[PDB]
Each structure stands twice: as structure tokens, then as C-alpha cells.
Amino acid sequence: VKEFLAKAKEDFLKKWETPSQNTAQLDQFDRIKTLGTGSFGRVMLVKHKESGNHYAMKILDKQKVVKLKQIEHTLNEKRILQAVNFPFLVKLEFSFKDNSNLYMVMEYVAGGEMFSHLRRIGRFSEPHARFYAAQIVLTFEYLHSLDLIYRDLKPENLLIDQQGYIQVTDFGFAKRVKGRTWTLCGTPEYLAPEIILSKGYNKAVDWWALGVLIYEMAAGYPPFFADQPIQIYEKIVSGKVRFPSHFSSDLKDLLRNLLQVDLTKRFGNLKNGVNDIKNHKWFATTDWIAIYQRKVEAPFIPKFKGPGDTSNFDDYEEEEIRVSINEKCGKEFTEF
């Protein structure tokens, strides 16, 4: 594993130091349908004209990015995504910009969000939840070894591919950082206590969030929920967790060590690092190399309906892609 990560790091740093830029343009694609949405634009299923391949095009309105003060985070997202390479990370296939928008064109993952399947089915069995969890463990091992913090783990940001495996999307809050960092960002249910308490935090926030994800997958609801974000934060900070009746002893023990307020005690954050998690009883049946190699048979394979089927995705209202004749925010996004 040490030699694997060493070469991964040389590969990543070459791309981090000289990023890809301007690798397509809007009129190379025909827009088909919205696959998903957010505050600063949207994701569309598109067909690339010359190859016929389908992609998921994330379109960000530069003026909305500036309004929500996400300039630097959007530059982080794209610089990081163009540089990384791991089986469970979605690939950025192209990127470009025009007078109005920023574009990141990814491989289209037609199985939909884990969030959809999780809410519909209700909850995942422990073997089903552990198969997904193991991929996230290996993915955070890889990201953290590049000094990247992910910061937005949740079922909404996990897509299920045609093999039943996970692809992590949405690097909007990902950041390359060697020290402590301070931005209040993430999703409320998934925030580690040290984020809420404004004291500076590091990569162990991702391992707390893996705790929240595993709990939610296996319970069907998160460990801390309330109608408003402020009431969510009060519960996280008190830190008391209750477990469903059906949770295994092994699972509850893993969760008490991930959802641990005390940094000196939180798994993934000790001297043994990720191996405290890999070697936990809950993961005893996990063959870590076979998961990396995608040799493990997936517990659920979304119904496949041909290239460009969107039936594993919700419907969304459809709006014009406006491109001004005046360049917006040209300086701010120069490096994009």
C-alpha cells in the first residue's frame, strides 16, 4: 500500500502543479435533461456530438458562485478533480468556461444517487452498508495521502455505477491542506463537532462523517437529526448517540469510535491511522484488495436501461442555459 500511494502522489502532483484547462466547449454537446440541482447552477445529462457518449455536465453560474462566496472553493473543486484518479472517484472528462458559466463534464453514472435507493428501500443491511463503507475507507485513505480533505460525505454525493460500486462526486468543498483549516462548510447532519465549535479542524472530520454515513446507511436515518440546522448542531455537540435495536455489537462499537468527540480517540486519527478502521471486527469479512479491484459481488445492481436512461434519477424542472455576450468574472476564474 505504501508504494502504491507513493506513485499515486507523483501522478497527482504533476497534475496539481499544471492543471488541465479548456478541454471542450459547450457546442460539442447536446443537452438532454437535468439529473440534479443546487444553489449555483445544475447537472445535466448531455450527449457529446462527435463520440455519441453521454456525460453529466455540471454547470455553475459564475455570478451565483461569487454571490455565495464560493470562488476559491470552485477553483479547489476543479483543480483537485482534474488531478485525482481512484476507482471510486468520478472522473472529470472535460472542463471549460464561457462568458457566464463554468463547466465540469464527468462520466455519467446512470445508477443514480445512493440517497434515492436508501430512502426508497428504507435502510441497507449491514453487509450492503459495509460493502459501500469499505469503498469510502479506501477513497479517504487515498485522498488524505494527497493532503486532501473531502468535507461533504453524504448519500446525495455517492453515485451507484453499473457494477453496483460507488462513485464519489461533488468536490465543491474539497481542499488541499497541510495544516488545520477553519471554514464552516459541509452538510449539517454530517458536521464533526470541531467544525461546529469553530476551533480549526483537520482530515479527522472525514472519518467522523464516515461514522454518520455508515449509521445512516444501516439505520435509514442519521444519528443526529432535527427540523432546523441549529438543533442538529446541539445534538452533535452533546454527542450522545442511540443505536437501532437491530445494529450488531460490532457495528455499534465501530460507530462509537468514529462518532467520537475526542480527537485523541477517534478512529482514523490515531497512530495506526486508517488501519484501526480496516482491522475493526465489523470489517472482518472485508477483503480490502478485492474491493479495490472491484472483484467483490455488489449487493445491489441498479436496473440498467440503455445509454442515456435517467429513470434512476428524479425529475427536475428545466431552464435555459443563458450565455451573456459580456464576459462575467473573467479575472476571478482565470485559472479555471
Binding site: 444517487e113 461533504d152 453524504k154 446525495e156 459541509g186 449539517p188 437529526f225 432535527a226
Partner: peptide, 19 residues
């Protein structure tokens, strides 16, 4: 049950990032 309280709550749909 916690499941009922969750299902009756206002946070069962896709959740937005904060900034």
C-alpha cells in the same frame, strides 16, 4: 419510534450544503 420522528421531520429530502 425514531424512524417515525424522522419520516415526519422536515429533513428527509436531499440536503443542501451550508457555506
Amino acid at each position: 419510534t425514531t424512524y417515525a420522528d424522522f419520516i415526519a421531520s422536515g429533513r428527509t429530502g436531499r440536503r443542501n450544503a451550508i457555506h
